[PDB]
Amino acid sequence: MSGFRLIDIVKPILPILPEVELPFEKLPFDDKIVYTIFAGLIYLFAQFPLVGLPKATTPNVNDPIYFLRGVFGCEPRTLLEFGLFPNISSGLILQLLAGLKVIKVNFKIQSDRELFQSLTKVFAIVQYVILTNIFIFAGYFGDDLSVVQIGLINFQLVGAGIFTTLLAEVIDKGFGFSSGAMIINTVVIATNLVADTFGVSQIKVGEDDQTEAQGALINLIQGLRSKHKTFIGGIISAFNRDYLPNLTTTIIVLAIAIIVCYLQSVRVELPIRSTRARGTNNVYPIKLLYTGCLSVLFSYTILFYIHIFAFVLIQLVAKNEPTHIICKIMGHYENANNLLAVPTFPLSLLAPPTSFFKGVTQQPLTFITYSAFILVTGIWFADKWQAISGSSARDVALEFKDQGITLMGRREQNVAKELNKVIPIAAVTGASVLSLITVIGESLGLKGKAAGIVVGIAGGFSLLEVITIEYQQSGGQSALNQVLGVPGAM
């Protein structure tokens, strides 16, 4: 309708769909653990295929995409092929607008804090419907059709994706434990790990990528060791060969795991004084990599989005034949002369070069530009994180200061200006160094999750460090049972 009124709001059509809204009842502790595992069991049905019989039969859908898979929190050829990717993206867009300071919002006011969050989950669903048209424009399914079943497949993916945003919400509002974005990220990087390493093997031949060999851990170690129920034996150590070494994926997951799990155990210690004494007191480490967790999640996400230089939105224009203002000048995703064919020359040097293989030493130039971009994007989203509240550096230092000085009388003062110098050096550069060791974690090998696994565990033990501090110091269910007991008063 039109009539005559001054509007530009989409307001009658908005309730006529049937999107979703969110809980309703919750209970702890037993109920929370049962419901959070239940949410991950609905996710666990990623083994069922999506509707579409001509794509499902002869082409079996085109080759698996081991690059989108981890940050999305997806799996190809299933209900949940988009995962968190549009939900996080709506967060990138509004992080960008409020962090460029084009749209200024003060987030410690109630009214426009709630507006931001509600707008994010509406724009998640708007992002979902444009993404579902984006994926069929990519030519993933191996059938691009006119309006028939290509409309129905895109509808289903949004409908199962409005479910996965509802799960992200449900866990977050306290139905389950943790945050629901954190959980779906961690169980997808988890699926990939034992599918590849423990797996199972099956005898077939196939020109296209088929899962003939999975179970690298079993094949390598039991071949090295002895003979089994299976007749095998002999050591396959390493090769550049088309037949996989089996040692290659076993070492690289461990290599990633040790180095970033120790970076995750790097914290910056800032001391506090007197316990009821005279002299020094606690060593209080702060958690750099849970602060930088959402910064480098945003950094990893944006590398797949950008029209100028990325995977998803350049694969469309590579597929799309007409040449105009938008053209495959953005990047050529097509067959190549090369032995292994992936984009021959794109502007996507922001595209990470790793795969379920060995690292690539053959282009150092694309490595330098890739590293440079994600460090720049890491400090870009670092200053947005500070600007858009959180624990704001300006507010918390000022607010604690006046509050404490006049807390009846009087009081003696704080380590929060002592924090004030050292926190910006730790925060901005800790996002940047997290981004630097994200590309190092990728370069060791593996993909389909290589930067998504490093951030997933990195924010996981730094989240664990927060929860252990709240357990032991603040009280309740506690972690002080292991060691504590006897401090002193002078």
């Binding site: 809204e21 809980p23 309703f24 239940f38 209900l79 479910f163 799960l167």
Partner: peptide, 21 residues
């Protein structure tokens, strides 16, 4: 408010619908 039960029911029925087709 919707319900945590409604989302649970919706999804399982969606899974049963999709698998065959």
């Amino acid at each position: 408010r919707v319900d945590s039960l409604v989302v649970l029911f919706l999804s399982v029925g969606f899974i049963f619908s999709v698998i065959a087709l």
